[PDB]
Amino acid sequence: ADLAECNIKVMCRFRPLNESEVNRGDKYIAKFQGEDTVVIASKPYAFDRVFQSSTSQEQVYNDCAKKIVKDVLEGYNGTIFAYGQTSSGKTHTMEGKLHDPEGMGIIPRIVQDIFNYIYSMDENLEFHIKVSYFEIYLDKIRDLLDVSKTNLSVHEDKNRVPYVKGCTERFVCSPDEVMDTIDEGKSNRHVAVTNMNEHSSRSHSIFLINVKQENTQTEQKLSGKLYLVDLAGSEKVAKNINKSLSALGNVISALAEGSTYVPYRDSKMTRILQDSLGGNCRTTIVICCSPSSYNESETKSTLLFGQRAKTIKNTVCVNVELTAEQWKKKYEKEKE
Ligand SMILES: Nc1ncnc2c1ncn2[C@@H]1O[C@H](COP(=O)(O)OP(=O)(O)O)[C@@H](O)[C@H]1O
Ligand SMILES: [Mg+2]
């Protein structure tokens, strides 16, 4: 009818072994079945989809993000975030070779698709797309489009949904504008960072696409937020090196158990993704793993996080906006 309940989608992507791993006695320990199951230590883990090391960027996008883009275009909130220990393949998955047609990742592909669609519709559909690009490090938000603001606050919008107050919101009209924006952010992130390899492994990168469209015929306004997240490393020290990752794990556990209380507040990361996790949003998590034997423990660890998240259910619905005028017309036609 109106709204529907849906599970969080969880895709597991293994990457091929790197030079480093090959040089040691590292052996490929992932055994594949069908295309939804992977075996590690004579144990099966079934997901919505399992991607082998040979799976191309393009394949991942089609099986994972293309659908999200379609929902967002329909007025749905969607989220996609990569999860896994450092070097498992999160950035490669979400970003890839930003401008390489064959090597680019989910984000740049989603950007092209959004505009391909728009350029297809008639003039009756008017889209207003603004983007934001910030990062969360040590529980503090920095705007990648304006690095001078380094500790932005999370507030609630008019519809009581979490949002980074005061973060840059660029209005874009073409893919190119979004790409330049993304290049601008990648670049500023280096400022005041004394070691990008370590920094990025320990920080959260969030790219937000706010899509608002209005139909002149139907007189309806739809709006959907699209979070594309490149989480910090899930590896442990005894416990998660990233407290924010401990939070994400607790939130995921609470939801998966059906507990009335969910610790979203433990970190602003989990507060920003509050709607993505248990709310009005179509979320897809891509857990990234190393097929390496040297990494077997972190992998099982990652596979479990995926198995829990998979059991969570959201109650989503299109996000329509009506004026008091439009609202009453319908109210009357219904109050009949
Ligand atoms: N699926 C993959 N296929 C080929 N190379 C990959 C794949 N995933 C990761 N890599 C490579 O592995 C290294 C780890 O990359 P990255 O995605 O940035 O890891 P993470 O973001 O999880 O720390 C990089 O050099 C990257 O290009
Ligand atoms: Mg990374």
Is beta strand 9-14 parallel, antiparallel or unpaired with respect to 49-51?
parallel
Query: Which pair of tokens denotes residue 326?
Result: 């439009």
CA of 237 to the centre of ligand 1 (A): 21
CB 288 less than 6 A from any atom of ligand 1: yes
Q: What angle do CA 231, 131, 127 make, to 5 degrees?
A: 130
Q: How many angstroms separate the CA atoms of 44 and 335, rounded? A: 54
What are the φ and ψ backbone dihedral angles of 123, each rounded to 5 degrees?
-75, -15
Q: Domain extents for the chain?
A: 1-336
Measured by CA distance, the residue closest to atom 27 of ligand 1 is 92
CB 86 less than 6 A from any atom of ligand 1: yes
Give me the DSSP letters along 50-81.
EE-TT--HHHHHHHHHHHHHHHHTTT--EEEE
Residue type, 254: A
CB 16 less than 6 A from any atom of ligand 1: yes
Name the closest ligand to CA 60: 1
- The ligand 1 atom at the shortest distance from the C-alpha of residue 82 is 22
Q: How many angstroms separate the CA atoms of 105 and 96, rounded? A: 4
CB 87 less than 6 A from any atom of ligand 1: yes
Could you tell me which residues are annotated as the binding site for ATP?
84-91
- The ligand 1 atom at the shortest distance from the C-alpha of residue 86 is 23
CB 89 less than 6 A from any atom of ligand 1: yes
Of 172, 176, 272, the closest CA to residue 225 belongs to 272
Q: How many angstroms separate the CA atoms of 283 and 265, rounded? A: 19
Residue type, 222: L
CA of 298 to the centre of ligand 2 (A): 16
Of 290, 292, 320, 251, the closest CA to residue 12 belongs to 290
Is beta strand 204-215 parallel, antiparallel or unpaired with respect to 220-230?
antiparallel
CA of 287 to the centre of ligand 2 (A): 13
Q: How many angstroms separate the CA atoms of 265 and 251, rounded? A: 9
Count other Cβ atoms within 10 Å, centred on residue 307.
16
Name the closest ligand to CA 135: 2
Could you tell me which residues are annotated as the binding site?
84-91
What is residue 97's DSSP assignment?
Answer: S
Contacts of 229 (CB under 8 A, 6+ apart): 79, 80, 81, 82, 94, 204, 205, 206, 207, 273
Q: What angle do CA 113, 118, 123 make, to 5 degrees?
A: 170
Contacts of 78 (CB under 8 A, 6+ apart): 68, 69, 71, 72, 224, 225, 226, 227, 281, 282, 283, 284
- The ligand 1 atom at the shortest distance from the C-alpha of residue 13 is 1
According to CATH, what is the number of the domain 1-336?
A: 3.40.850.10
- 232 within 8 A of 203, measured Cβ to Cβ: yes
Measured by CA distance, the residue closest to atom 10 of ligand 1 is 89
Query: Which pair of tokens denotes residue 263?
Result: 């610790």
CA of 95 to the centre of ligand 2 (A): 10
CB 204 less than 6 A from any atom of ligand 1: no
b or e along 67-77 (b: 16 or more beta carbons within 10 Å of the residue's beta carbon)?
ebbebbbebbb
Of 310, 318, 299, the closest CA to residue 47 belongs to 310
Q: How many angstroms separate the CA atoms of 298 and 57, rounded? A: 23
- The ligand 1 atom at the shortest distance from the C-alpha of residue 88 is 22
Query: Which pair of tokens denotes residue 212?
Result: 């608002």
Best mutation site among 12, 59, 92, 289 for ligand 1 pocket (most ligand atoms within 8 Å of CB): 92
CB 162 less than 6 A from any atom of ligand 1: no
CB 92 less than 6 A from any atom of ligand 1: yes
Contacts of 26 (CB under 8 A, 6+ apart): 17, 292, 293, 294
What is residue 292's DSSP assignment?
Answer: B
CA of 86 to the centre of ligand 1 (A): 9
The resolution of the experimental structure, rounded to one decimal in Å, is: 2.7
Of 229, 182, 264, 188, the closest CA to residue 83 belongs to 229
Query: Which pair of tokens denotes residue 43?
Result: 């144990």
Q: What angle do CA 319, 323, 325 make, to 5 degrees?
A: 135
